[PDB]
Amino acid sequence: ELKPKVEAFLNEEIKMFINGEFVSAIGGKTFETYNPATEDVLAVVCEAQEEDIDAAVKAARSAFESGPWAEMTTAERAHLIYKLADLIEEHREELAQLEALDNGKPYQVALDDDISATVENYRYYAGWTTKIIGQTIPISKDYLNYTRHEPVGVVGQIIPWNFPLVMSSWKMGAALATGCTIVLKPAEQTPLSLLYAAKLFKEAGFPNGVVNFVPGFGPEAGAAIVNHHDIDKVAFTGSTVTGKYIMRQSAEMIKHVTLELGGKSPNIILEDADLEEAINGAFQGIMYNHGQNCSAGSRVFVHRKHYETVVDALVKMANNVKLGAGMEKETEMGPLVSKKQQERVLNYIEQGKKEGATVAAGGERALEKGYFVKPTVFTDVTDDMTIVKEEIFGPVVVVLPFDSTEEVIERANNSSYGLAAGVWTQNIKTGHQVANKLKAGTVWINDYNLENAAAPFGGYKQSGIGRELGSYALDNYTEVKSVWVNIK
Amino acid sequence: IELKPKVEAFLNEEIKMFINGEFVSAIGGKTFETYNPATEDVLAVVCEAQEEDIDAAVKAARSAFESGPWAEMTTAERAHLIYKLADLIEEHREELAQLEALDNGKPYQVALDDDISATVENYRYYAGWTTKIIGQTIPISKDYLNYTRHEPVGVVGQIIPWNFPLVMSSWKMGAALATGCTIVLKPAEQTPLSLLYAAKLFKEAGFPNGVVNFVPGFGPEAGAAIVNHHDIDKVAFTGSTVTGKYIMRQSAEMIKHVTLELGGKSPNIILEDADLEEAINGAFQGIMYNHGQNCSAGSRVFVHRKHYETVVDALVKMANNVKLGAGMEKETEMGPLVSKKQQERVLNYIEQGKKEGATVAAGGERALEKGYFVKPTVFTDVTDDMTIVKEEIFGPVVVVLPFDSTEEVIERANNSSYGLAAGVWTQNIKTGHQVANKLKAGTVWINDYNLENAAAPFGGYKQSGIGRELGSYALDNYTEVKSVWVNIK
Amino acid sequence: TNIELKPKVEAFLNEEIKMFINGEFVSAIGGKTFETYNPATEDVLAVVCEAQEEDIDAAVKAARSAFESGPWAEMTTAERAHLIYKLADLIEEHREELAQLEALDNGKPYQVALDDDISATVENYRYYAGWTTKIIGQTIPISKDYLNYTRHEPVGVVGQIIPWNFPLVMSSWKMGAALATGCTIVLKPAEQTPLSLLYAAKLFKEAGFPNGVVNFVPGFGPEAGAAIVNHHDIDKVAFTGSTVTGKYIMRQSAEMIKHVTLELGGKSPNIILEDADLEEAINGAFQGIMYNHGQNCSAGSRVFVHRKHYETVVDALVKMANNVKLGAGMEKETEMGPLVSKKQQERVLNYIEQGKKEGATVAAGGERALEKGYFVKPTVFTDVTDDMTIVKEEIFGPVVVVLPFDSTEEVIERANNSSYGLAAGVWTQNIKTGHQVANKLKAGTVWINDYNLENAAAPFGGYKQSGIGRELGSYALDNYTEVKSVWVNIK
Amino acid sequence: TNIELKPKVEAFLNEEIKMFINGEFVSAIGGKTFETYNPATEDVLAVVCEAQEEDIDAAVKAARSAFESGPWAEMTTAERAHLIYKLADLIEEHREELAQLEALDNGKPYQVALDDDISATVENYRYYAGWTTKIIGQTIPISKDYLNYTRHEPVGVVGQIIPWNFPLVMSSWKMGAALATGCTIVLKPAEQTPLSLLYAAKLFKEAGFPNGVVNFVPGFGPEAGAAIVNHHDIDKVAFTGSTVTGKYIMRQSAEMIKHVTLELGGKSPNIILEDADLEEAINGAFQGIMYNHGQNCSAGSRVFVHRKHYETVVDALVKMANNVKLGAGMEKETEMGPLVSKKQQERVLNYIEQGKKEGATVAAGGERALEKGYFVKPTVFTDVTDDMTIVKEEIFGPVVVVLPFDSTEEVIERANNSSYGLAAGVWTQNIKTGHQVANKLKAGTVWINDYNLENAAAPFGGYKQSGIGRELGSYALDNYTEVKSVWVNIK
Numbered sequence A: 001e002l003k004p005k006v007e008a009f010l011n012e013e014i015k016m017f018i019n020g021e022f023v024s025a026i027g028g029k030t031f032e033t034y035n036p037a038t039e040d041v042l043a044v045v046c047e048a049q050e051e052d053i054d055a056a057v058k059a060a061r062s063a064f065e066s067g068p069w070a071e072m073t074t075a076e077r078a079h080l081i082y083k084l085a086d087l088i089e090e091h092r093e094e095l096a097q098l099e100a101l102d103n104g105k106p107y108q109v110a111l112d113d114d115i116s117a118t119v120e121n122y123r124y125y126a127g128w129t130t131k132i133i134g135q136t137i138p139i140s141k142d143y144l145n146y147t148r149h150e151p152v153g154v155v156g157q158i159i160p161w162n163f164p165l166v167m168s169s170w171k172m173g174a175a176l177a178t179g180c181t182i183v184l185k186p187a188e189q190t191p192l193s194l195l196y197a198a199k200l201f202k203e204a205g206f207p208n209g210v211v212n213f214v215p216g217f218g219p220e221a222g223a224a225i226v227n228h229h230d231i232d233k234v235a236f237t238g239s240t241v242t243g244k245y246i247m248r249q250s251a252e253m254i255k256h257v258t259l260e261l262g263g264k265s266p267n268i269i270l271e272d273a274d275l276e277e278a279i280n281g282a283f284q285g286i287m288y289n290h291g292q293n294c295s296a297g298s299r300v301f302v303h304r305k306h307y308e309t310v311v312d313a314l315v316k317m318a319n320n321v322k323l324g325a326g327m328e329k330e331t332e333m334g335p336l337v338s339k340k341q342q343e344r345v346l347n348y349i350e351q352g353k354k355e356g357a358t359v360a361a362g363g364e365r366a367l368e369k370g371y372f373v374k375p376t377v378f379t380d381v382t383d384d385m386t387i388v389k390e391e392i393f394g395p396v397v398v399v400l401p402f403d404s405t406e407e408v409i410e411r412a413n414n415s416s417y418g419l420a421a422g423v424w425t426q427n428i429k430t431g432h433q434v435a436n437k438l439k440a441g442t443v444w445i446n447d448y449n450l451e452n453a454a455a456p457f458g459g460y461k462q463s464g465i466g467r468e469l470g471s472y473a474l475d476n477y478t479e480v481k482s483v484w485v486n487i488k
Numbered sequence B: 001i002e003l004k005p006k007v008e009a010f011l012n013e014e015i016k017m018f019i020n021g022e023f024v025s026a027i028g029g030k031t032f033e034t035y036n037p038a039t040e041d042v043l044a045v046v047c048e049a050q051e052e053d054i055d056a057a058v059k060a061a062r063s064a065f066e067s068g069p070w071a072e073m074t075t076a077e078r079a080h081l082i083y084k085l086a087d088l089i090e091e092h093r094e095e096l097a098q099l100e101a102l103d104n105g106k107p108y109q110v111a112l113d114d115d116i117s118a119t120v121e122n123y124r125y126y127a128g129w130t131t132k133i134i135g136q137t138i139p140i141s142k143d144y145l146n147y148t149r150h151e152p153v154g155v156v157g158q159i160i161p162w163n164f165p166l167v168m169s170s171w172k173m174g175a176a177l178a179t180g181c182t183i184v185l186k187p188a189e190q191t192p193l194s195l196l197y198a199a200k201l202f203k204e205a206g207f208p209n210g211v212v213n214f215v216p217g218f219g220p221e222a223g224a225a226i227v228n229h230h231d232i233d234k235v236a237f238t239g240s241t242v243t244g245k246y247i248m249r250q251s252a253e254m255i256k257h258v259t260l261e262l263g264g265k266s267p268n269i270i271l272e273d274a275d276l277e278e279a280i281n282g283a284f285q286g287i288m289y290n291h292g293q294n295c296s297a298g299s300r301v302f303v304h305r306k307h308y309e310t311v312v313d314a315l316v317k318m319a320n321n322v323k324l325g326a327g328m329e330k331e332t333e334m335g336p337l338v339s340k341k342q343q344e345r346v347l348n349y350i351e352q353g354k355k356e357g358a359t360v361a362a363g364g365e366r367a368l369e370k371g372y373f374v375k376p377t378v379f380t381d382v383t384d385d386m387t388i389v390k391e392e393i394f395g396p397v398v399v400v401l402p403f404d405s406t407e408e409v410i411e412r413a414n415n416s417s418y419g420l421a422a423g424v425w426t427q428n429i430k431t432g433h434q435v436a437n438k439l440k441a442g443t444v445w446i447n448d449y450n451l452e453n454a455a456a457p458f459g460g461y462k463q464s465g466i467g468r469e470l471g472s473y474a475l476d477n478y479t480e481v482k483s484v485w486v487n488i489k
Numbered sequence C, D: 001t002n003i004e005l006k007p008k009v010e011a012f013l014n015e016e017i018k019m020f021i022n023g024e025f026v027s028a029i030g031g032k033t034f035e036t037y038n039p040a041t042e043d044v045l046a047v048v049c050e051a052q053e054e055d056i057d058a059a060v061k062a063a064r065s066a067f068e069s070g071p072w073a074e075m076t077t078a079e080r081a082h083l084i085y086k087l088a089d090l091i092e093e094h095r096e097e098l099a100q101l102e103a104l105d106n107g108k109p110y111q112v113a114l115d116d117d118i119s120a121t122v123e124n125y126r127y128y129a130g131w132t133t134k135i136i137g138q139t140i141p142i143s144k145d146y147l148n149y150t151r152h153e154p155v156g157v158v159g160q161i162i163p164w165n166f167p168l169v170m171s172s173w174k175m176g177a178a179l180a181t182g183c184t185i186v187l188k189p190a191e192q193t194p195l196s197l198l199y200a201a202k203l204f205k206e207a208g209f210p211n212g213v214v215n216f217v218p219g220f221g222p223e224a225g226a227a228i229v230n231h232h233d234i235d236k237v238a239f240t241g242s243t244v245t246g247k248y249i250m251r252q253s254a255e256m257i258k259h260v261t262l263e264l265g266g267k268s269p270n271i272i273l274e275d276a277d278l279e280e281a282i283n284g285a286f287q288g289i290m291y292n293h294g295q296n297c298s299a300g301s302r303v304f305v306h307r308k309h310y311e312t313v314v315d316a317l318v319k320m321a322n323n324v325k326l327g328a329g330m331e332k333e334t335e336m337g338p339l340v341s342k343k344q345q346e347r348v349l350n351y352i353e354q355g356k357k358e359g360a361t362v363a364a365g366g367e368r369a370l371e372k373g374y375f376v377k378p379t380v381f382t383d384v385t386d387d388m389t390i391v392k393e394e395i396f397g398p399v400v401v402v403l404p405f406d407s408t409e410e411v412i413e414r415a416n417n418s419s420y421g422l423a424a425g426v427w428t429q430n431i432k433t434g435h436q437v438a439n440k441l442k443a444g445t446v447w448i449n450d451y452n453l454e455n456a457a458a459p460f461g462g463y464k465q466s467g468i469g470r471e472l473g474s475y476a477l478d479n480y481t482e483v484k485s486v487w488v489n490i491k
C-alpha cells in the first residue's frame, strides 16, 4: 500500500530540478515512466531537451564559481552531505516504494540494500570532504612545493536504471565531496526515485544549482551533457556501446572520462570449495537483482568433480524463485525493467538453444503480464558460444565444467570484460594465487556481490576506465595543481 | 665542439631499432632520415618501424610481462635495474647531450645541464618508488579482510615528441617501469637518436628481453599501429592537441585508459609589487627557453600597467641580443626550430599576427643563412581574440599585454582552452597564494618560471591534457586497482 | 545583567554529580565526594562523586570487556561512525547547557564557550566520525611469493588525563581520535572542571554507545590520575597538562613500556617584523595572549616587535589591556573572566612579583581585580630581557612580555632559545620572509599573519619540551593505533 | 675447512680500531681501549678505542654542527639520496669483508652473514635512499581563508644504540630511516660486536658523507651508551636491546621530553594448527628458533602444536637438534656458531638448569658444546607448563619449548598471555583460519605459513612490553620526524 508522500508525488507530473527549483521542460515536453509488473504508466515526467541541459549547466557553473558552495568550509560542506544522508534515511520507505514501482525490484531489498547503501554512501563521502589532502614535497630548500587537489568544476553524470538511487550516490557522493557541482541524467526507465530525492537536497540546504537533475532520453538529454562546451568532466555508467560514444565525444574537448560498463564475470568453484556455501554464492551471484547487474556471475565455473551437483542445485533453486510484483510482500524476483529488455534476454535464450546449449531450467517468459523472465540455467555450453561471451542481463546463468586451476584461470580471463570475479576455495595459498591472476577489478574469495562505499569498484579492459567508490573515486573529480614558491 | 668517438661511431652506421633485446632492422628493410636542423644536412639514417615491427615489439613486451625475469623479480631487483640505468645514462652524459644538440637543435651545454641530468634524476627517483607502490587495507567489517592491489596495467604504448626527446622518454618510462609494466615506445621522427643510443644502456644495465622496445618511425604508420593495437593495454601520449584528440578517439574502441600531455598558452603575470628585475628575466626565460618549443612557455606575458612600458623595452633588447647558432657551437644561446615545417608554421603565425593588427616590436623573421632559425620575437598592441594570443605558436614568440586589476588579469589569464602552467610575480604573501589558487593551470610558479622536478606532478587543466606525469601521481596511470574481499567469517 | 540558567543545568546541579562507568551513572564505591567551584564567586557550584583507585579499576575492567567483546567489538566501521556523529548532534543540541557549564565551572565567558569551545567540540567529533571508515593500512609489494599487508589495530584501553582550561574541547581531542580507531576509554577530567564532561555523559548514553566504551572518573591527580598512570591493564596513555606531571607520567609508563602522548606548556613567540600589517598584528598580539585569560598553552606570551614599531605596539597593548571588561562568565558584558582557582591566581600574581623584582616594568595591570573571584588584571611587561624568569617560564595568565629586536636572524635565535616549542606567529606581508621564518622556528604550529587558530584537521603539538606526539588531524590516529605486519606465504 | 681471511680484514684487524667522529678516524681523547673477542676461540680479535662521555660530547657537537650548517643542511633531497645509494653500493662491494667480520666478531656462520645480513643491509640502504625524495606532508583543505600545510622536518641529532646479535643490519635499520629524513647520527655499537660497523665507516667516507652526518662511538653501555641517553643536545633517542636497559632509557628520556623508540625482546609463539602443512611447519618451527643460534628477539621460542601432531613434531625437532653442526663461524661446515659471550652462555645455561628444576624434560641438548668457545647445544624442552620460567622469559639461546593444545580459542589465549608481543607464526592451510588467527594475535608481525621473514619495506615492532614504535617500512620515517603545521592567512 502506497505511502502518502509517494501518492502525492505520483499525482502530479514530475518536475526537473534545476537551480534549486522544480521546473517543467522549457518547451513543455514530457515522457512516460512505467511500472514493469503491470505495464501501466506510473508517471508523466518533464522531458529534458538540449536547452534544459544548457540551463542546468549555467546554474551549476554559477554555483561553483561564486556563492555559498564556493565559499563554504570543508566542515560546512560535509554537514550538508550528512544531513542529506539523514533525510534519505527518514524517507527510506518512500524511496524504496519508488524503486519498487519504477525499477521493479522487491520492495524489501530496495529498502535493505539500495536505500541503506545510498545512506552509507553519503555518510562515507561526507567524511572525505575534510580529508582530501594534497602534498608538501621536499625537493630543495629554495622552494616550497605543494599540490592542491582542486575540484575539476562542473561535472556531467549519466547513470542507468538497474540500481537508480544507489548509482546516483556513487556518482554524487564523491563529486560533491571534492566540491564540484553536478548535472545528472537519470535513466528514462527509472527517473522517479532521484526526482523525489531532489526535495531532500533542497531541504538539507544545498545552495542553488549545486545539483541539477535532468530526466529524459539518451540521444537528447544524455548527448547534450556529453557534448556541452562548459562541462569539465564526464562520468558514465551503462552499456559498452554508449560507453564508446561518450569517450569518442569526450575526445573533442580533452575531457576526462570515467566509465563503468558491462561484465561477464566468472564465479569459480574449485575442488576444495565449501560446496554448500559456493552453491548459494553462485546462485545469488547471478540471480541478485534479476541478473540486471554489471558484476553478475553469469559464468559459473565448477570443478568437474562437483559439476553435476552444483547444476542440480542451481536448477532446483532456479525453479524455486518466487516471481511477482515488487510491491508484493512475498516476491523474491521481479521483472525486467522494460519490454525491450525482456525481448532482448529472450532472444539471448533462443540464441543459446540454437547454438546447441541445453536449458536445464527456465528459458521463457513468466506470468500473464509484466516483463518477467523465468530464472534460467544453461548447460552443454562452450566458450565460443554467444550466450557465454556476451552480457545478457537477465536471470540467466551458464554453468561450465573445468579440470585444472590453470585451465579455469585462462578461460575466466579470456574475455573482453574484467569487472568482477568470484573464487571458492578453502585453501589459503590457492585463494590469493587465483585472486592475483584474474583480470578483474574486484575479487571475492568465498563470497560474491559485496559492495561498500569504502572499497573501490570498476573494470579492467572493456568493463571500464577508472574506479568509483573508496578513496580512489575522489581522484576523478579532482584536478592536481603543483605550486612552487620561490623562497630563495 | 668536437664530436665524441662513440657518437662518431654511432652515426657512422645505420641506426637500429631495439626490439626484444636486440638491435634490429625493420623487418622489411625500410629507412628514413634525420636531420641536423642547424645545417639542413642528413644526420643519420634510421630503420623505420612499420605495423609489422610494432607487432613484433608488442609480442616481445607481452612475453616479458607474462613470464620471465621481469615478471618474477622482486621490487628491489627492479629498482636496482632502473638505478643502474640512470648511472649508465650519467656515464654517457656527454655522448647523449651531443646527440640532443645535433638531432634536435638545442645548445650542447643546456642539453647536458638540463636534459641529461633531469633524465638521470627522474630514473633515480622512480627506482625508489618500485618498493613503495602501495595499496590499501580497508576496515569495513570484522567478517572480511578488504585489501587493494595496484597491479601494473601491462603492456604500455607510449608516443613522445621532439622538443625534449630523452627527458620525455624518462617521463614516460620511469613511472611505467616502476610499476612493472613493459613498454613499446615511439620516439619522434625528427629526434630518434638519443633514445636509440640510450638503448645500448638498457641492455647493459641488465633489462630482460622485451621489457623495453623502441620503434622509431612516422606517426601515421608506427604511431597509428601503437594507438590501434588490440594487445596494448594502455596508451600515453604527448604532442599536438590534434593528434591527442585522434588517439583518445581511437582508444574508445578498446575502452583504453589514456594519459595526454598537450599544448599551452600559459600566462606569466607581473603584478604591481613584483621585483621587476627578477620578473623581467623570468618573463624572458619563460618564453625563450628551448627556442619556445616548450608547452609550458610563458607565451602571454601580462604586466600591470605601471610596469608595462618598462618590461616591453627590456624584452625587446633581450630578444635582440640572443645569439643564434648551431647547438654544437660553444657561443650559441638559442638554436633553431626542429624542422622546415616548424619554422614555416611559426613564421606563418608571425604574419597572421601582423595581418590582425599586432605590432612586431622585435624579430619577426627568419635568421641566418642555413637552418630552421627564427628570430626572437615580441608582439605588442595585442588583443585577447587575436589568433597569436590564443594559439600555441611554439617558437620564440612572445605576446605582451597590459592590465589594470588583479581580478581582471585572472579572468583574462583563465580564458583559454589551455591550462598547462602559469607564472605569478608578487612580493605579497596573500596575493601570491590568492592568485595561484584562482588560476586554472596544472602548475603555478610564484616568483619563478619553468621549474620541473621528478617529484612534482605536471599536466594540464582543460585542453592541455588529461593526467599528470612526474611525482607520485604518474604511477597511477600505469596501474590497475584490484579490490579483494576475503570472507573470514 | 545575568545570563539566565537553563532548566537542564539547574536540574543537573541540584543532585550530586555522578561518575560514568560501564554505561551507568554511579557514585564512588567508597562514597567520597569533592567540591567544584564557580571561580567568579568562589562559591561551591557542585558536589561530585570522587573516584579512587578502586573506581579506576572498575572503569578499566569495563573498558576491557567492551573492547574484547560485545557490540563495540563487533560493530562495522560505519556503525561506529554513526554513533560518533549522533554524539556530535546531541552535543550541538545541548550547546547552551554545555556552554553555561563551562562558563560556570571553568570561568570563561558564556558567549565564547558557545561559539568556540562547544562548536569546536561538535566539529571535532564530526571530523573523526569520518575517519572511522578510513583508517587504512598498506599492501606492500615486496615479492611475488608473499602477500604483505598492515593492519592499523586499535591499541586497546586508553588512559586519558586532561586539564581544566578548555574542558570539553580537550575531552574531544582525546576521545575523537581514540574512538575513531576502535579503542575504549577511561578519562579523568580536571578536578577544577568536571561538570561539562559529566553532563556530556548523558549524550554518550543517548547516542547509544555500548556500556564500557567510554568511562569518566572525576577526581584528584595523586589518586584517580595516578591510578590511571599505573594500571597494568591500560594499553596506552595520553596526557595534557603541566611539564612536571608529564615527566612523572612518562617515567611511570617506562615500567610497562607504554606508548605516551604529551601536550605540555609553551612560551610561544608572536613576531611582528618590519613589514607587518600593523593594525592586524597588534590585534593578533593582544588576542594571542589575552584569549581565554592567557590560560592557553599556545599563547603568545612573548611579543617580539621590530624596533621601528615597539613604542606603537606597547601603547596599543596597554590601552587595550586597560580596556578589557573583567567579570563573571555568566554575565553578559564580560570579555575576560577569572583564573580557574585561587592556586592559579597566586601562581600568576607571583610571577608578576618576580617580574618587578627582576627589573621589569609593569606597563599595565600587575594585580588582582574585583572584590571576589580569582581575577587578575590584563598585564603588560616592558623593559624585559631574555634571561628573566617571566620571559622564560609559562605564567598561564593574562600576562604578556614585549621585546624589541633589530634583525630577523636575531629574532629567530631569540624565539628559539627556549625549552618550549608549542607554537609561533610571524607577521610579515612578504612572500619569502613569511615562509623562511616559518621554516626556521622550532614549533609545532606556525601561523603567518594570524594567531591561535585550531581546527580538527590540522595537527597540534610540540617540539622539544612542549610535548611528544600530535593531536588533531590524521596524525592523532597514529597514537591510538598498533601496527601489525602480516606476511602470507603464497609460494 | 677454513674460510680464508680477506686481505682488507687482515689489514683492518692488524691495527688498533678507531672511532669515527666528524669525518675522521680517531682515538678516544683519553686514549682508552677495550677488547672484542672471537667467541668461537675466545681469543682477542681486536683492540678498540673506547668512547667515554667526553667522546660522545665531541660526536654530538659534530653532528649538531653538521645538522645546522654545511653541505648536509643545504643539499637537495636528490643529493642526499645519492649519498645513501653510493653507500649501499660500497657495502655490496665489500660484502665478503663485512660478512667475515660478523662471523669473527659475532660468531654466526659466514655464508649466512653474507646471504642474509649483508644483503639486507644493502637492500635497506637502497630502500631508504628511495624515501628521501618522497617524505611528504599534507595540504589540508580547511577554509578559503587559509592555506594549511604540514612539514615533516627532520628532528635533528639522534642518538642510536644497538645490540650485538645482528650488528651491521641493525645499524642500517637505525640509520637508513634517520638519514633518509635529514637527521644526523651519534650511533654506539655493542661492546661485543663493534667491528663490522667501524669497517663500514671507511664506506661512509668513501661515499662522500659530509663531516659529522654520521658518528660512531664504540664502548660500554653504562659509559658511552648512558652519555648518549643523558645528553641534553640529542633531540631523539632510539634503542634496541634488553627490556631492562630500555626501561632505563625511557625513564631517563622523560627528563628531556625526548621521543623514544624501543625494539625489545620477545617470547614469540609459533602455532601449528591441525590443518597445517606439517612438512613446512616442522622446518618453520625448527628454523624459527634455531636461526642465529636463538639470538633473535622474534625467535619462535614457544612452539604450540595441536595434539594430533604433538608427538610427530617433538620427534622431528629432537632429530634436527641432535643433527646440527656446531663450529666456528669461519669454518665451512658450520651450521650454528656459538653464543656471543661467556656471560651470554652462562645466562642460557642458567635458564636450562632452571627448566630442569621446575620439572621440565630436556628432550635434547641442555648443555654446553665443544672444547673451546661459547657454544651451547640446541635444546628441546618438553613437559612444560605456562607458568614456568623457561616458557615465560626470553632465554636468547637455541632453546625451544614445545606445548600441546587442544582448541584454537585456547591457543590464541595461551599465546597472548605474555607481556611480550613481537611476533607470531601461524600454520594452517585454511584461508579463513589463517587470517582469523592472525587478527587475534597480539604481535607486531604475524607470519602465516612461514617464519622469521624481514624486509626493508615491512614494519617491525612490538606490542605490549616488546616495544614502542616500528622500524622499517615507511613507518620508521615518523620516528625521526617532527610535524609542523603552517597556517597561512590569505584574508
Ligand SMILES: NC(=O)c1ccc[n+]([C@@H]2O[C@H](COP(=O)([O-])OP(=O)(O)OC[C@H]3O[C@@H](n4cnc5c(N)ncnc54)[C@H](O)[C@@H]3O)[C@@H](O)[C@H]2O)c1
Pocket: A158, A159, A160, A161, A162, A185, A186, A187, A188, A216, A217, A218, A219, A221, A222, A223, A226, A237, A238, A239, A240, A241, A242, A243, A245, A260, A261, A262, A293, A294, A391, A392, A393
Ligand atoms: N554497467 C552497468 O551497470 C549497466 C547498466 C545498464 C545496462 N548495462 C548494459 O547495457 C545494455 C543495454 O542497456 P541500455 O541501452 O538501456 O543502457 P545505455 O547504455 O543506453 O545507458 C543507459 C544510460 O545512458 C543513457 N544514454 C543512452 N544513449 C545515450 C547517448 N547517446 N548519450 C548519452 N547518454 C545516453 C540512457 O538514457 C541512460 O541514462 C544492457 O543489456 C547491459 O548489458 C550496463
Ligand SMILES: NC(=O)c1ccc[n+]([C@@H]2O[C@H](COP(=O)([O-])OP(=O)(O)OC[C@H]3O[C@@H](n4cnc5c(N)ncnc54)[C@H](O)[C@@H]3O)[C@@H](O)[C@H]2O)c1
Pocket: D161, D162, D163, D164, D165, D188, D189, D190, D191, D219, D220, D221, D222, D224, D225, D226, D229, D240, D241, D242, D243, D245, D248, D263, D264, D265, D296, D297, D347, D394, D395, D396
Ligand atoms: N631486542 C633485541 O633484539 C635484543 C638484542 C640483544 C639482547 N636482547 C636481550 O637482552 C639480553 C642480554 O642483555 P645485553 O647484554 O644485550 O645488555 P643490553 O640490552 O643492555 O645491551 C644492548 C645495547 O645497549 C647498551 N647498554 C647497556 N646498558 C646501557 C645503559 N645503561 N645505557 C645505555 N646503553 C646501554 C649496550 O652497550 C648495547 O649496545 C638478551 O639475553 C636478550 O633477552 C635483546
Ligand code: NA
Pocket: C036, C037, C038, C039, C104, C105, C106, C191, C192, C193
Ligand atoms: Na570549577
